[PDB]
Amino acid sequence: FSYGAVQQSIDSRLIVDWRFFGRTEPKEENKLWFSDKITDAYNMPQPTFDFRFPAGRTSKEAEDMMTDMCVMSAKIGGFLPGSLPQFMEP
Amino acid sequence: NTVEYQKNIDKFVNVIQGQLMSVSVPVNTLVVDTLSPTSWQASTFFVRNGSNPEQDPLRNLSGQAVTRVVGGMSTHWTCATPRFDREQRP
Amino acid sequence: KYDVVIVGSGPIGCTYARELVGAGYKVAMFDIGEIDSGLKIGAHKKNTVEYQKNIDKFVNVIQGQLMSVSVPVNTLVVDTLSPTSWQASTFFVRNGSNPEQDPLRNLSGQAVTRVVGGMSTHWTCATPRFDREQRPLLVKDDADADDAEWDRLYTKAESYFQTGTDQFKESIRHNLVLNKLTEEYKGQRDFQQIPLAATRRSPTFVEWSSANTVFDLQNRPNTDAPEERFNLFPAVACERVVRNALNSEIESLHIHDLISGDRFEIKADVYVLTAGAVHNTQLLVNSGFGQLGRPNPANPPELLPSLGSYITEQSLVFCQTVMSTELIDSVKSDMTIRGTPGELTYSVTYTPGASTNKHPDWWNEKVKNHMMQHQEDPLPIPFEDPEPQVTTLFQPSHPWHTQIGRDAFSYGAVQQSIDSRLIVDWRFFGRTEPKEENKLWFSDKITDAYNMPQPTFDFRFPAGRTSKEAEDMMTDMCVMSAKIGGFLPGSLPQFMEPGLVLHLGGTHRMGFDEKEDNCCVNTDSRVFGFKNLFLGGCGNIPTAYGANPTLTAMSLAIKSCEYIKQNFTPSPF
Amino acid sequence: KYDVVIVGSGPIGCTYARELVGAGYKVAMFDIGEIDSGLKIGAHKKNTVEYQKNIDKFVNVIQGQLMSVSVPVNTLVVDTLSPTSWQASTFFVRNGSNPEQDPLRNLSGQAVTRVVGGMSTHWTCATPRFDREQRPLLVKDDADADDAEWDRLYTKAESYFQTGTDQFKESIRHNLVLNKLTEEYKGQRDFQQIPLAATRRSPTFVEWSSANTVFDLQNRPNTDAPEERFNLFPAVACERVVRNALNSEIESLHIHDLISGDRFEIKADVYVLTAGAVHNTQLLVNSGFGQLGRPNPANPPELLPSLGSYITEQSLVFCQTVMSTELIDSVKSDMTIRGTPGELTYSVTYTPGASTNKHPDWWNEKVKNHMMQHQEDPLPIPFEDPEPQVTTLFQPSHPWHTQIGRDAFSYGAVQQSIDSRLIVDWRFFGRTEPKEENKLWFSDKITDAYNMPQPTFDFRFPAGRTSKEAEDMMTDMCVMSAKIGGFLPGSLPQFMEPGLVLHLGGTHRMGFDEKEDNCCVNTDSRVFGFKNLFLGGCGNIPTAYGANPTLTAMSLAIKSCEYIKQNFTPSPF
Ligand SMILES: *Cc1cc2c(cc1C)Nc1c([nH]c(=O)[nH]c1=O)N2C[C@H](O)[C@H](O)[C@H](O)COP(=O)(O)OP(=O)(O)OC[C@H]1O[C@@H](n2cnc3c(N)ncnc32)[C@H](O)[C@@H]1O
Ligand SMILES: *Cc1cc2c(cc1C)Nc1c([nH]c(=O)[nH]c1=O)N2C[C@H](O)[C@H](O)[C@H](O)COP(=O)(O)OP(=O)(O)OC[C@H]1O[C@@H](n2cnc3c(N)ncnc32)[C@H](O)[C@@H]1O
Ligand SMILES: *Cc1cc2c(cc1C)Nc1c([nH]c(=O)[nH]c1=O)N2C[C@H](O)[C@H](O)[C@H](O)COP(=O)(O)OP(=O)(O)OC[C@H]1O[C@@H](n2cnc3c(N)ncnc32)[C@H](O)[C@@H]1O
Ligand SMILES: OC[C@H]1O[C@H](O)[C@H](F)[C@@H](O)[C@@H]1O
Ligand SMILES: OC[C@H]1O[C@H](O)[C@H](F)[C@@H](O)[C@@H]1O
């Protein structure tokens, strides 16, 4: 599951991917709900999210996780241009 | 699991992308101001292209997607199956 | 106390200075920007040896002094911030954006330049005349007298700018393109060099004209001009002209000295506003002309109800092409080649004067020398060959201006993989019908960087002829460019962002009668009702035009100066 | 005939002018570029009111005067040309590219600036001292005497540049970042303002220093300096110094006047080359020092065999962050808020002097006023609050320089969707071991735009410490930046193109003994063997350094001038 154009200029044998996954506190306010008006392609109530990563531990850990990936990946090699350290779309 | 995909693994991302249908796409507000004067041109950012007017673009899981095929998302998944430790587990 | 005060040191303000300082008036000029071009004040920034050796870097100077007029509130979604980062709940008013602006009815590319010399320190120097179809009338009911008057004025403007049509005549690429287009449209269209405000100094250096050419902006008296009186005051923002209670005369100009921070009033006999099509309108609105704030028809303006309405901006289409194989081969049609490049025996020859040759001897000599001296190079065009500067001017059957060549104002990353000698730019400029509904107005709440009412556009290209022509113009550029070569990937045919062209007109438009012609100044560029207030620049131009407007604006300024000299007496020295 | 001739009008050349014109020498200075900064000759281009109101446009001025040193032949494949377009069969030498250059062993970002004032007309003004670890010795075997000598020199250099550490002390954002980093590294690292060659004139205007600050470049004698003798000659390319047959003395400087085209010889008692780290080396090689052409060890140079070897350039890493929610909320920690924004009842208050307040009253007043006056704005930081200017200087345990704030030299499209007040830039600069194999050399075939031998690099970051530190530096920037906020998408942590940093050293390096220390100039910056030839600039610096080098180079120039004044007598006036 590559996230951008696959590069061809650096030998694939040298390339190592890094994915770090955080945990998220369950919060009442974070919701999946369904429209009473708008429908999806199968004529069913349209899904709608109301979501943010919780403040507090979830957010603190997510940024510490980012740092940890920078620190650990550096032991193997430097970043590949075009695949620099980033949060992925929610 | 085809011989062809395991000889051309960099092409498998296309199978994944081809069966991830976005759950909730907010109304688009990108400005295109280089249309030809003769082309039909919007006065507002109206509800277009199957977008969901209920969705707040700033409180979304924009990357959430669903797969409608026999086997579900297990026809494309990475196959990683760790146990949860106590801390993560109900 | 001055005889005349001029707001703005661009080429139109310098027209007024040239004429009035020369006529013995005591003149002051203010500019909100600063001296920026070297010791030649207000000169073209491209006239350095370094820029003419590195012309692809000049786009940076242009971009560095185009400050966007009206930027709508941004609504781009960034959803990959870290959870710890401060995150917006709304698309609030950020980064100096203008909340009044509808992003869909903008001239997003419109920009202004605040430097001594104005936009003439970076402009392309193209100075065509308008034909009758594009030009406001200066004489009613007498087409020959109107023609003779505009000829007189344009001739004088051409002298001030040092306009010529021959500076590129020794370019191979220029004449290659020119001749092919002449042959292809034989007896349907005429091609010539773009008329250019410039003087060639050497085969590799062109002294491009500017405001400095028109008037050198040195204070006077000085040794070269001992009986003249001129003072330039840079870093001075001019904010308002004060009207008498009769609205018959301006009594002072209120200024903000940007270096001390202090505000002052300046008295003169005559006031001239040459701050540009946007900033003249801003100053006037700030002075109680027109209407401040979002247009509201239920509240008719007291003065100049047409100010800021009927605005015009040109449609612009662009592409670049890579020269055809056939055209390249034709460059070397007169050569005989023996042997193989790089060997002792290699020989490229031609017979000078030979009646079968397609090209003149000077061309043939250049090509021969290039091929013998650079036997590793695969093209016949010399490395220092100047660019094309080609036009077919606006005509009823092709009602757009055209510039075909190499322009320093590149619109994207400059490519390096295709040889620059093969590349030809195409820019076609449409005319736009003046319509009341198309407006430049100024916020009564939001202010700009100089604490003045924030400019806001309400603009669309008119339906009907304007829109039909703009799309026909696009097609015409595709059809014509194909005669020279195919499109360069990365520069495919496209409309440019509205206003990028910077040919805005009609913001303080000219005509014979304020009411009947929906206008702000008369044909002496005098503001209706006011004895001593004159406006100069493209804002005056009331017509739909496709050609570049500056020469026309200067011609009107010349005529306005004739009026001034005939009606106001200079102080004794 | 002059007493002293200086090649280059950058800040190091102006150091020589300042010292020697002041000491009563008859001085000429040549610059290949032209006067470009307004009436203050050689001044900082960012000192206009317009640029300080539109700082995001200044990157264009920088880019417009960085001309790439060595561009390898391009091999990008364009396969979507029209069949009719002329099409290459090979990747031939196009567009001024350098066929000598290995694209994989380049400093592709290295660039040069040819304007009066040199790169000081655009620079950031950061002027840190080097600590012992980064600094060449000026006194052997006596660390205290070495420290005292560098202190003396740096103190004088700081006065010439008007270096200070307090210009940003009234910025909220500055102190927010500064204080958080101090707290987070409590007793492991020290933070302070970046020392900056600048003087604040108002809360919204900073007069940034430049070559003009060091010496105003006005010709002399003049009314302010009636007994001084100085002439500046712009648009003059200096091409060679002529050696006597003994290689003990320079006899003339050969120049090319770019405006007439003519060549001349200039005689002086003393010759100083301050053309920059690249162009000093070019001129010297063109003059028979070092070795012309691709290095060939089998042909040992006659003179200065170390010239062009041991070159150093810094690794540079960069990112931007978006301020944390926690830091933003902390700005308004002392406020009590009642009511809701936008209503008649809304009230933001603090108690001045209250001992429980976290911030001084001036901060609290600013925040109170912003929140009450802009109740639609969601942030507590005032709109005109200046940027951070934060550093933790190089130390053995973190051997890189750091600049944390807002830099006018943006590296990509400037984003508009995140509020600029939230954005903080991070630049970490590594030191590079000097290695014989790392070279700047000059082609014996290919020439540049001024008809001089074409510069070519052969460079890689050394294996071992340099490379280990550069990657540790990257990590350190990730770790430290995270304390302030997460990364800005579009500006994620990255190494910058080699040489973009423009901190090139060691090209004509300094030391005590030509042979033992593999060097070109001694500690008076005198070229070994030559009584009257001196070199100034970062090319002198022989050490591995991470901090910005200009202050150090100026300090060496000061010392060189002491030598000159002690050994050459000025002509009588
Ligand atoms: C797409 C993706 C998913 C996973 C990974 C990688 C990629 C790119 N990797 C991965 C996963 N999980 C792991 O534990 N480890 C890995 O390495 N991914 C997620 C995993 O793929 C899912 O968690 C898993 O399949 C969930 O299984 P499930 O609960 O059985 O759900 P599925 O979505 O797979 O299948 C549901 C199914 O029902 C259908 N459908 C949906 N609506 C209806 C209605 N209304 N009527 C009838 N049928 C319905 C779908 O069509 C679908 O087939
Ligand atoms: C930027 C641009 C412009 C032109 C071309 C190319 C580029 C990239 N090429 C071109 C042009 N026009 C042509 O006819 N042919 C060409 O090939 N371009 C437009 C041309 O450059 C303008 O039409 C022309 O300068 C207009 O002259 P002007 O009416 O004198 O106006 P300027 O904007 O040049 O100067 C006005 C001036 O006043 C100042 N200022 C603004 N506000 C104030 C206030 N409030 N107080 C005091 N001073 C004020 C500005 O700073 C400026 O210098
Ligand atoms: C461009 C850049 C540079 C610096 C920073 C930022 C940017 C984007 N920031 C910075 C710098 N250094 C610091 O210590 N701190 C900062 O925050 N930058 C580098 C600094 O700008 C340079 O180190 C400095 O000017 C070097 O001074 P110099 O040794 O005087 O050299 P210059 O290149 O400035 O001027 C040399 C000069 O000579 C001319 N020239 C070149 N060749 C010739 C020949 N053949 N004949 C005659 N004249 C010649 C140039 O035109 C130039 O003006
Ligand atoms: O960007 C559009 C521009 O293109 C050409 O350079 C024209 F000469 C000019 O008048 C115009 O402003
Ligand atoms: O682009 C790298 C630059 O970044 C900072 O602005 C530094 F001050 C400067 O010395 C350097 O040249």
Author numbering:
A (entry chain A): 454 to 543
B (entry chain A): 92 to 181
C (entry chain A), D (entry chain A): 46 to 618
Provide the publication's sentences verbatim.
In this context, Trametes multicolor pyranose 2-oxidase (TmP2O; EC 1.1.3.10; for a review, see) is of interest since it can oxidize both β-D-Glc and β-D-Gal to the corresponding 2-keto sugars, which are intermediates for production of D-fructose and D-tagatose. TmP2O is a homotetrameric enzyme produced by lignocellulolytic fungi and has been assigned a role in lignin degradation. The reaction catalyzed by TmP2O is of the ping-pong type involving a reductive and an oxidative half-reaction. Therefore, to evaluate and compare the productive and competing sugar-binding modes for oxidation of Glc and Gal, we used crystal-structure analysis of 2- and 3-fluorinated Glc and Gal derivatives bound to the TmP2O variants H167A, V546C, H450G and H450G/V546C.
